[PDB]
Amino acid sequence: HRRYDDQLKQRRQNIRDLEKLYDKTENDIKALQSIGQLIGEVMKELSEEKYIVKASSGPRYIVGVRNSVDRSKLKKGVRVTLDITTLTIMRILPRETDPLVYNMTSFEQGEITFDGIGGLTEQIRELREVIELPLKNPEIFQRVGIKPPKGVLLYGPPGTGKTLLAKAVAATIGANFIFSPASGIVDKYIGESARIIREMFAYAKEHEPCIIFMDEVDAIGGRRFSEGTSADREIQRTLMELLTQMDGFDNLGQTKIIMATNRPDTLDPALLRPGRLDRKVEIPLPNEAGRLEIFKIHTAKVKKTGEFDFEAAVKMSDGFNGADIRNCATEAGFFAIRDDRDHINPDDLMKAVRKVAEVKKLEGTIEYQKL
Amino acid sequence: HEKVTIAPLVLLSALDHYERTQTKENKRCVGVILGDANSSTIRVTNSFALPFEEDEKNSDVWFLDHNYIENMNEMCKKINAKEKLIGWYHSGPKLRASDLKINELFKKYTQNNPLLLIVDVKQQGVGLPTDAYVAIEQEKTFLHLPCTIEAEEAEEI
Amino acid sequence: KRIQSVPLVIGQFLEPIDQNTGIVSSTTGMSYVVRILSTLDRELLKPSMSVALHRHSNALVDILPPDSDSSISVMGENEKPDVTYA
Amino acid sequence: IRIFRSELQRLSHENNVMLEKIKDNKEKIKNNRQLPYLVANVVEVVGKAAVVKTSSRQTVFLPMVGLVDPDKLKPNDLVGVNKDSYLILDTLPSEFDSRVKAMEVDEKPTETYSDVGGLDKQIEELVEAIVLPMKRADKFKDMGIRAPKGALMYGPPGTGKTLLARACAAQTNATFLKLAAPQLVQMYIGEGAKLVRDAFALAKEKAPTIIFIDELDAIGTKRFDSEKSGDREVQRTMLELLNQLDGFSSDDRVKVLAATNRVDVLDPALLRSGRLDRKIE
Amino acid sequence: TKETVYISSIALLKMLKHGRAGVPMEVMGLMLGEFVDDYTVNVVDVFAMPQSGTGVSVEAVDDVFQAKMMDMLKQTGRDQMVVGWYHSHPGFGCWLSSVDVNTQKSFEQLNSRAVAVVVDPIQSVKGKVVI
């Protein structure tokens, strides 16, 4: 009696799979009947039923309206949806101008924390006052009467963890952040770099808890006035846009500007003036007491012997930065591979530190011309 | 007070229902109007025609079919969702004694004060023969409001 | 004058040439020389006055009011004042 | 008893009749699909819809089509749209943008490690850089050490250099993508950084291709600009090389080998524990 | 050749108000009237079809809703059959597309006297209705 029933139960797996494919294909034909619709921003208002919306293709047209939309949201500064044939307003959408995914992706996955940035504790509280303090309790600045600092400058020798300060805040505060590299906005067609900058600050009025960073700007942060220079107007006007949002009458106060650079001398002296970057946070080379904490950070996940002394590499370290200390633990791992050792010999740790000391040979000291 | 504004589409429709129905023997043609009465200016954007029969010698006998009320509602909601029943109109200027009984039929369907519209098919008057009355608490009295013509490119053109 | 009534190309007046004829500059970048509508007048407009043009033929239709569109049109006051001269 | 077994047999018969109607609808879909899809950039993924931007700079609004899924769609994605109705008929062919101009894809060269001698001291340095982390990556995770991100090889000109790089692209039998430093300088602003960004953007999908860069003397100069001697056009290419190899890359499958002539002129910040580790002479 | 098609004054304002309300979607509605031989088409009253997002396709015609509304019109004094339908084309002139012709072919087997009217409530605001 159950012989024929078992053959019918096995067919039920195929029937349920076809039933999902019957409505999926049927919904595809219904989607093909819908055509495209233009998108434009409302400029002015001519009549009640007649508005002027600038098309995305670059010309302008006088479009219509219908009874399916609210005329209150059709005012100026609102991006609407036009028609590709009749050229009439269809729907109403929020303003989105080039939502670049690379700048909006902050890598929300937690990796570096306040423990891995250790040794900078003296300079860590500098960012907490210009970031954590105004966002958590903005009323403190109103009691004394001081204005909340907008821009913050990060400069110093490379490899000291200035970039790690950007990743440590994203994994703790949790606010929406935007990574803005210097070479990502330099795309040029016609006045493109000046428009992209206005696109990043356009999200400041939408999402209030936002802080826009800047990654190692050696180019568009300088002054470089115009003499010759093979038509630099795109980079020249790029500097004018970064000095606009932090200057003109537009008021935000919830947006902080974190600018990182390898040296203040390559930055526009006008940008260094107060009113744009209020506080300049310097990240110099850690002291002898600050280096010892760094060795324990990189070797925390490294398997080695139970007896360990990192005070030897403290004196061995001369002019090293937070990054070069990581290379000492990386190079020491290959010394035990030739001897077939899972745990790294503490004596081999000093071999890599002495090796890294001969890797530089180039500069390594900036003093008089660095603030 | 409030104001009454009617598009010529509704005025011409109420005047054309007398010849098409071929109403004779001194009878009336009753129909329903649609619009929005919530604002201070009542705007009638739609009108219809319903069969109505009432005895002349007996004013206590009246019949109105409610299927046309439910059929036009399901028809309009599938076309214009902004139109609701604000009242009804009559075929002549002279008021009868059945205005109070007809007001009790639409009081359940209408969500606002029923609007009494009066349209003269003979046009024996001067100017605008169309009259608009509003039934309020007196038992009940009819307050008249001035009737105008809607100015729009969907009608006057 | 009401023939068009439909989406129109935004033009800009340049210089007068002939009676009921003028040169215009469309936002598309291509300048055209068309005839001024009979119900309009050359004195009712300005040398920089912005007008409207036909969709296809780009002929003059209606003269827009003396205001233009760049960014927001800049009415100039929205929550602008903060501090004073003192 | 017979009623329960009769409804199940007739159910498959009704599905077979409707199956021919779906096959006819699939033929209509194939007929509605025409070769040109053009290109459209998807800037956004209440209802579910998608906002597309064509390469002609025309922004078109279209509802979600059943040919794609909202979870598969991502912002900054190039797909096809109909020329007339402006609807997406095509998915993403596992690549965004393109290789632009210079891209080198080679299966394997004819050079091996047996064609030279006396260089075994420097060869072992390359074995511990781009070779061992490929197979032994599971072993390095146990020790808790990060794989090396690259090594700088300069020496005097005419010794080793591009020759040893050919042996690394052969015995390893992996993908090789060549990126030349002097080819990264273009007259258009942003084109120099686009070549660097598009090179490492594919390096994740193209496997650890071990990008090799030769003649680095063109990149790494900074100094300062006063009056004449116009600069900073090349510096924008360097900033993309520095930022791409720090924040968003250089973890496991991202490795870069650099070969220059003289180290007297270069960027002191270019050498870092996150980019160039071993110093090979 | 040329043919004179008579349309009642009440049908003009109904077809104008229906198509002008919604600017997009290209709405549609039926008509009623009589004929004189083959050289005269008379239109008395018009009917309003329900709205659909398909833009006048073969699926936008509901025979169930059409059959129920015509039974109520016969009791209101309408004895005339369906003489055709009207289709709005905002922003364009008077012309038939590939979809409008294919949709028009479906009603040839039902009533061969059906008339497809192209009305433009947008450009008809100049005082001369283009239809």
Swiss-Prot record, chain A:
Q: Which residues bind ATP?
A: G156, P157, P158, G159, T160, G161, K162, T163
Q: Which GO terms describe its cellular component?
A: nucleus; proteasome complex; proteasome regulatory particle, base subcomplex
Gene Ontology biological-process annotations: ERAD pathway; nucleotide-excision repair; positive regulation of RNA polymerase II transcription preinitiation complex assembly; positive regulation of transcription elongation by RNA polymerase II; proteasome regulatory particle assembly; proteasome-mediated ubiquitin-dependent protein catabolic process
Instruction: State the post-translational modifications.
Output: N-acetylated by NAT1.
> What domain of life is recorded for the organism?
Eukaryota
The record's keywords, sorted A to Z, are:
Acetylation, ATP-binding, Nucleotide-binding, Proteasome
Q: Show the GO MF annotations.
A: ATP binding; ATP hydrolysis activity; proteasome-activating activity; protein domain specific binding; ubiquitin protein ligase binding
> Has the keyword Transmembrane helix been applied to this entry?
no
The family line of this record is: Belongs to the AAA ATPase family.
Q: Name the job this protein performs.
A: The 26S proteasome is involved in the ATP-dependent degradation of ubiquitinated proteins. The regulatory (or ATPase) complex confers ATP dependency and substrate specificity to the 26S complex.
Q: What name is this protein filed under?
A: 26S proteasome subunit RPT4
Task: Write down the species.
Answer: Saccharomyces cerevisiae (strain ATCC 204508 / S288c)
Traced from the root, the source organism's taxonomic lineage reads: Eukaryota, Fungi, Dikarya, Ascomycota, Saccharomycotina
* Underlying gene: RPT4
Full-protein interval shown: 67 to 437 of 437
Curated annotation (Swiss-Prot), chain C:
Q: Name one GO molecular function term.
A: ATP hydrolysis activity
Subcellular location(s) per record: Cytoplasm; Nucleus
Modification after translation is described as: N-acetylated by NAT3.
Q: Which UniProt keywords apply?
A: Acetylation, ATP-binding, Cytoplasm, Isopeptide bond, Nucleotide-binding, Nucleus, Proteasome, Ubl conjugation
Q: What is its main location?
A: cytoplasm
Task: Name the Gene Ontology biological process terms.
Answer: positive regulation of RNA polymerase II transcription preinitiation complex assembly; proteasome regulatory particle assembly; proteasome-mediated ubiquitin-dependent protein catabolic process; ubiquitin-dependent protein catabolic process
Pull one GO CC term from this UniProt entry: proteasome regulatory particle, base subcomplex
Give the record's family classification. Belongs to the AAA ATPase family.
Designated name of the protein: 26S proteasome regulatory subunit 6B homolog
Q: Summarize which stretch of the complete protein this chain spans.
A: 87 to 172 of 428
From Swiss-Prot, chain D:
What is the top-level taxon of the source organism?
Eukaryota
> Any one Gene Ontology biological process term?
positive regulation of RNA polymerase II transcription preinitiation complex assembly
Modifications after synthesis and translation: N-acetylated by NAT1.
Which subcellular locations apply to this protein? Answer: Cytoplasm; Nucleus
Q: Where does ATP bind?
A: G155, P156, P157, G158, T159, G160, K161, T162
Sorted alphabetically, the keyword list is: Acetylation, ATP-binding, Cytoplasm, Nucleotide-binding, Nucleus, Phosphoprotein, Proteasome
Annotated GO MF terms = ATP binding; ATP hydrolysis activity; proteasome-activating activity
Residues recorded as bearing Phosphotyrosine in the entry = Y113
Q: What does this protein do?
A: The 26S proteasome is involved in the ATP-dependent degradation of ubiquitinated proteins. The regulatory (or ATPase) complex confers ATP dependency and substrate specificity to the 26S complex.
Please report the name of this protein according to its UniProt entry.
26S proteasome regulatory subunit 6A
Upper lineage:
Eukaryota, Fungi, Dikarya, Ascomycota, Saccharomycotina
Give the stretch of the parent protein shown, with its full length.
Answer: 41 to 348 of 434
From Swiss-Prot, chain E:
* Residues the record lists as binding Zn(2+): H87, H89, D100
What is this protein's name?
Answer: Ubiquitin carboxyl-terminal hydrolase RPN11
User: What free text does the record give on domains?
Assistant: The JAMM motif is required for the deubiquitination and degradation of ubiquitinated substrates.
Q: What does this protein do?
A: Component of the lid subcomplex of the 26S proteasome, a multiprotein complex involved in the ATP-dependent degradation of ubiquitinated proteins. RPN11 is the only catalytically active member of the lid and serves as the essential deubiquitinase of the proteasome.
PTM info: N-acetylated by NAT3.
Family of the protein in this entry: Belongs to the peptidase M67A family.
The listed location of motif JAMM motif is: 87-100
- The range of the complete sequence contained here reads 23 to 153 of 306
What organism does the record attribute this protein to?
Answer: Saccharomyces cerevisiae (strain ATCC 204508 / S288c) (Baker's yeast)
- Which proteins does it associate with, and in what oligomeric form? Component of the lid subcomplex of the 19S proteasome regulatory particle complex (also named PA700 complex). The 26S proteasome consists of a 20S proteasome core and two 19S regulatory subunits. Interacts directly with RPN8 and STS1.
